[PDB]
From a paper:
In order to observe if a dual substitution of both the residues (W74, R75) by charged amino acids could compensate for this behavior, we created a PANX1 double mutant (PANX1WR/RD) by substituting W74 and R75 with arginine and aspartate, respectively. Incidentally, these substitutions are similar to the pore residues of PANX2 revealed by multiple sequence alignment and structural comparison with PANX2. Surprisingly, we obtained a minor fraction of well-assembled PANX1WR/RD particles that allowed reconstruction of the PANX1WR/RD structure to a resolution of 3.2 Å. Whilst the global structure resembles the PANX1WT, the pore diameter was reduced to 9.3 Å compared to 12.1 Å in PANX1WT. The presence of R74 side chain facing the pore renders the pore of PANX1WR/RD highly cationic as compared to PANX1WT and the pore diameter resembles PANX2. The main interactions at the pore in PANX1WT are W74-R75 cation-pi interaction within the subunit and R75-D81 interaction between two subunits. As these residues were mutated, the interactions are lost in the PANX1WR/RD. Instead, in PANX1WR/RD, D75 of one protomer interacts with R74 of another protomer to stabilize the structure. We analyzed the differences of ATP-γS interactions with PANX1WR/RD and PANX1WT via MST binding. The data revealed a two-fold reduction in current density in PANX1WR/RD compared to PANX1WT but retained an active channel despite the constriction of the pore radius.
Pannexins are single-membrane large-pore channels that release ions and ATP upon activation. Three isoforms of pannexins 1, 2, and 3, perform diverse cellular roles and differ in their pore lining residues.
Author numbering:
A (entry chain F), B (entry chain D), C (entry chain E), D (entry chain A), E (entry chain B), F (entry chain G): 26 to 158, 194 to 355, 362 to 369
The structure:
Amino acid sequence: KGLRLELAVDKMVTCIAVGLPLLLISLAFAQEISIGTQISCFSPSSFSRDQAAFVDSYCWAAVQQKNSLQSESGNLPLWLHKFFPYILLLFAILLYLPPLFWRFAAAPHICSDLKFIMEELDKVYNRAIKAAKPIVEQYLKTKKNSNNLIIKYISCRLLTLIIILLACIYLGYYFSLSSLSDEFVCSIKSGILRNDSTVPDQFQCKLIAVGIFQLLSVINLVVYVLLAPVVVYTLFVPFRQKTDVLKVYEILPTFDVLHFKSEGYNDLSLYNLFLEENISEVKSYKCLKVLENIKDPMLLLTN
Amino acid sequence: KGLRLELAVDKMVTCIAVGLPLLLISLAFAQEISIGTQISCFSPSSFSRDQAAFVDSYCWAAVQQKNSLQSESGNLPLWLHKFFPYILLLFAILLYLPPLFWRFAAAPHICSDLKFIMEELDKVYNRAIKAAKPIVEQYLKTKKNSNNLIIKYISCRLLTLIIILLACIYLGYYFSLSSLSDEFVCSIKSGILRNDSTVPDQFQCKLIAVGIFQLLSVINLVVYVLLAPVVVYTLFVPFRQKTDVLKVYEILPTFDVLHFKSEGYNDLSLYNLFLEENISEVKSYKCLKVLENIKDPMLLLTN
Amino acid sequence: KGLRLELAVDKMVTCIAVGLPLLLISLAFAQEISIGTQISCFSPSSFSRDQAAFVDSYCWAAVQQKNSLQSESGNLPLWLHKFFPYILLLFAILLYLPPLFWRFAAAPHICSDLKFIMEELDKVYNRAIKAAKPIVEQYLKTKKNSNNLIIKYISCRLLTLIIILLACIYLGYYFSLSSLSDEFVCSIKSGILRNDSTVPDQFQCKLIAVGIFQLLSVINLVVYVLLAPVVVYTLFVPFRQKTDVLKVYEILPTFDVLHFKSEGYNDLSLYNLFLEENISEVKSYKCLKVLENIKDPMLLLTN
Amino acid sequence: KGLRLELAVDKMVTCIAVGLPLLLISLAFAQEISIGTQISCFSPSSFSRDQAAFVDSYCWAAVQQKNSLQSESGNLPLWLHKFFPYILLLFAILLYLPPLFWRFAAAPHICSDLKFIMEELDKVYNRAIKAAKPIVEQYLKTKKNSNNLIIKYISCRLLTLIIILLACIYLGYYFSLSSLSDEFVCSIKSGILRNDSTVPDQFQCKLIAVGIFQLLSVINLVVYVLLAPVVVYTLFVPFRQKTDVLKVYEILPTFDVLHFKSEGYNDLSLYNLFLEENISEVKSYKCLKVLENIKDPMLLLTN
Amino acid sequence: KGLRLELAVDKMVTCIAVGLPLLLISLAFAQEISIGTQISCFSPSSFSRDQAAFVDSYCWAAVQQKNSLQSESGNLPLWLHKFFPYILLLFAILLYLPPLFWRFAAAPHICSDLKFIMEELDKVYNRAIKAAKPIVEQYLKTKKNSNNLIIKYISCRLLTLIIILLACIYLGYYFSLSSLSDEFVCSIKSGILRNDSTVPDQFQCKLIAVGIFQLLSVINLVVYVLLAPVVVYTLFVPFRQKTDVLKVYEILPTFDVLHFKSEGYNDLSLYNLFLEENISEVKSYKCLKVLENIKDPMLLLTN
Amino acid sequence: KGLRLELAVDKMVTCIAVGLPLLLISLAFAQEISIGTQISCFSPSSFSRDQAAFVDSYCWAAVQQKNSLQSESGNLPLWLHKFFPYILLLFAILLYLPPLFWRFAAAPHICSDLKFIMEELDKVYNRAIKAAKPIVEQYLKTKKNSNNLIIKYISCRLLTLIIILLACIYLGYYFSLSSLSDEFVCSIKSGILRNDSTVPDQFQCKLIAVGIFQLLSVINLVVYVLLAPVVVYTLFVPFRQKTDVLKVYEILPTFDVLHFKSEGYNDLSLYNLFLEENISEVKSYKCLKVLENIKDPMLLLTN
């Protein structure tokens, strides 16, 4: 309660990387701008409105099977054209899952430790205030050896980076299509229709809503390309920490002087990273910052 | 209130195994990507738009009866094609039911015991704190003999595994269809229509939205195949427990030293499993962990 | 407040027996899988699209009257085909009503007695705790003679069983239809249409969405067949009670020793059944169970 | 707050009698089972799809005027067929209004008196409890003379019974229609259409959704026929009261012995009826019932 | 808070008079019972489906201008037929506005005075109770002279009565239409269409949904005719008050004996009317009524 | 809690600049005023309704590719016409992002400092009040040197101004189109359609909903042109501050006299700007303003 328990940078990255595919999916087939269907086949004028509908439905369904259609770029582009929103949704879910793993596996494990450290710091400040008028340091030393949680953090970040990279590769390949792959030549000649001569041998079909799909693909690719360096930088946990949140506390006599920094690539670095975001919410923090920047015992006893 | 009362692994497994069939059902016939109907039959040009609609409706309804249609893979694939979402929903409900059974039959039976054990541990810690300046052990010994709740747990997990396995078998069989089973040859020649010559003997019909169905089936099959080892590992209740949540408490003098572990395949193992998730929410737990890892009476009396 | 006041078995039975017909009704004509209409009649090609619509509407409306249509299985199957969802909804309401009767007629009558008995047990435990360092028994004896509430309970269960049995009979009869009863021969020859020769004498009509109806009927029948033994067992109120919730309390000296069991087929059995579910929510219950299973005065005075 | 202030029988009667017409109205034209329109007229094949639509609309609108149509059962059945849902809604509102009158005119007038009597009884019980270790009777005597509220109660019940009876009469008359009154012979020959010869003199029209209307009418009639004896019995206010809620209180010495019963057909009977439902929610009630059934001063001083 | 601040009769009148036009508007064009459009014109068979649609739209739009159509009852009935729901909504808003004026202009002005008088009465009762063991009268005398609020009340009631009367006149005139005014003779001969001979000179049009409009008009007229005497009686503010709410308080010695009645046609009458509804919610009121009806000092000191 | 933490001018600017593109997008294709589709192509009368639909869909999809269409203003205007709502939404998101950055990166960093300064001022006022009967100044001096937050503020304002300017440029260029660019000449001659002679070589297509798009573009351009000077003025942070919120506090003896102003272009100016909005919510502020404007020790001790 009241703890962010999640970095701002990696709550923005998750929000963008999950919302954007959802937004693109919702915009791709929104009736505000969209057209009727996704396939349209040119059937002869003698055909009725139920034979033309059959041709459309058959050639939309037979886009999986390459034994009927005769395209120029192969059946893979048509496969991609039919199932673009499904792939976008799959990518969105694959991005959203690691945040759920991190939440369900480290919400209390970080919440309890954060609350305990905050209470220890508050007690130390209260003792110093009531004394002038090191449990936490030993806990930090203990956390230095335990190299468990930072491994999980960097593993989740690495797998999210891998998913982003593979989505970038897929979208860059999809956008590179000829833009004439949206049209093909179908044929309704299966079963009893193979022998009669009242149907033309081949129908010219066009996959509508492909230019929109390519536009959305390029938008997603450029956004993910911009976003990837953010995760790459986030991977460097020790470099993120600015080792200055504890040097202010070293002015206090009760607190253990010469506090350890975040270097070492351990869970101590992760706990420092989680601290720098939440220490600003501690009342004693600013009451000590004012004294440390303006300095001493008189000002300490003033508040 | 405040107790998870359900393991994270088996709240993730239930969530995935129930949500995924619902998601696939919602995506199968979502107008965002879907087509008009699920069947389309080719009727002669002389037919009006109400005779073609009658042919479509008749050949969609007569997909149950094999005395009219003349298919190549039998009527079973057509049966499956018509009722795929219903089978998916049935599987989803069959997965969701055992969680409801476990909830309705063990929510208070686990909640009361957990609260009592937490209060006993808190009282023991308070007595130790107020003394320096074994009811729970006997209850654990009692729970060791009672082999009732772990049997229910493993029974529910086993039946969920069986349901997952049978769903995997069904989806693997459904996906293995020829992909040409979506088309068949129907005939409207029942009753007074049998004698007239103004109707063709047979109509070529195609079941639309079958490739989408097979794609969803393969997605569900691969996800359930990935998920099955998780439940298989979950079946091994004694191996899951890391017998270290009580060895920390053995430092306390008031608490009964040499606490029993979770081995034995009894309700004690299940209670240990439920404890390891909830002990992290106990205030005394971390206040004892700090002392045990840094060690003693002086630090015990400090807090 | 906080009292279940309804058995888990008979809150599951009601939930299943009411939700399942609603689920089947919602699935029967859900546009996710359904087709356009429920009747389709084959009209000559010379007919316009408003004469064919008139034929469809007339032959759908005249399925009540048997003087026009010429079917083979009689007009009763057609009656059933037209009004299947209405019958399902009627069955659902008939199942849901007895729970409403039991609630509106016994919610306070059971709530007040349960709260009074819980308070009496708490007071007895408190007196025993504050004394070492029988109003409830006489109330139980009084409830033994009063044979009123168990009669209402078994009457409601019996009538719900009767409704389930009659629904099973109806659904088993409906599913046993020939599956060719969905088609019939109609005729629009009433009034001024009787004399003209521009209309064919008879039209071939088919009732769509009948195979789906039969599938739903068989699903409902099999579920209700599975569910009926549950209600049959529930009818045996005295056998359900495990007479062990009071033998634990007999260890207490203040409480009246040799507590009466639930046998006798009276309201005492029903009150025992309601107690076994709610006693687990009493704080004194487990505090006495630990002592009784591990045993005595020293442990009693410990807590 | 916490007072039912409305009898269970007459909160069930109102709920049924208001909900059922709403349910029937919602089911009559629910697209889950319904058909396209409510009228269908057979126009010649030479007519376009806008002349046939004009014929349908004209013959649906001219069902009010009997100078055009030539029916066999008169224009009254057609009037009823067109406006069945409106009449059902009017009946529902006429049933729902008297509950609103009773609420808006007697919610505080009964709430204040009930709360005052409950407080008086609680004070009497407290005085008896604190004394061993008649304001309410005089108020009851006063209420005996005041014959005002029971008159309003029986008037509301009588008018609801009259409304139910007239609705039963109307629905029984509507269901008794020939079932061939849903078809008639219309004619579009008003104005400039009277002289041309390109239109047939008469059109055969059928009112669809009449068999459904008759089914709903018979359902409503049978339910209201079942419900009427309930209101008839409810009319007998003095017979409803079981004069036993005050004889238990006569054991108390402070309370006025020989309490008056509910007989007399006054507001005292109504207040007794409202008491028997709410006295079960009084804490002192059961604490006195236990003593009275098991009996005395020792048990009175025990609690 | 807790004060009705609005008479039950004039909260029922407003509710009915505002809800009923809304209900009629919602029912007039509810697709549950309604038909496709509100106008239908008979165009020759040679016309396409876009020329017939143009004829319908033109003759629906040109119902304002009388230079084209040739009706028999004038263009005023057609004007009324096109804009019936708008007039109903205007009437509903005109009825709803005066309640908003009364609320926004007299909610605190009545709330503060009511709360002050209630507190004064409570203080007088408390003083009498604590004394045996006239500010409010002077305030009433002051309110007697101030003839301001009753003028506003009767003005609002009078204007609502005038609005109801004019709505009754309008609806009675609208219902009295010939019922053949729903049909007329239109002509599309404006501009370049005046010279060509491929269009008929005149088209026979019918305004659908006019019989429904007349039915709703007669329903509204009869309800408002029933409702008008209620407002007429409400206009007589002094006659409404039953001068008995203060004669009970005159038994108290501290309270000023011989309290003034409500006669005089001043704001005192309105304050009496507002008091009789809210005095029943005062605890001291019934505690004094019991004593006054059963009588004295002994009973006064008893409570 | 209770702190605005965002200037009114820059919460109005963000609200307008984000809501207006959303409002225009919602109005552009709202069915309340809109037409059926966005493209319409004129196909020969011999074409069926499925060949004309194919022509429409093909020429709407092939508006990306310039090898088929033959327009007069180039393919860029057609590109803009197809994707106008997408560009509007992109602009809206680009405007909305910097507010999210400022919130997520400076909500606690400003909230904690504001609360600390408010508490310091309250303590100073309380000490002065309890004394007659400089931590904050030193903190202000410290904030004077720290030039960090104002840089972020002006950077966000500058980038929002740049986005507004580029959106203005784009909308001014889009509105300047010829207004005949909404029509073009398409051709369905790709694949097997290239050789047959049953199709015309070129089709005349028109992009509907372009005049509406240009109207919305001019509205957005004029609003953003009006709004840009507001952001330009907002860029001048030091000029915004009226250095009078601290000169009132200098009357107090305890507070450090001769308080520094906001000039200097540092974080002190930003903190002054945030103070002037929130100081009005401080109770001591007005209690000191009254004394300072009416002046002294007697009035200071009066409150």
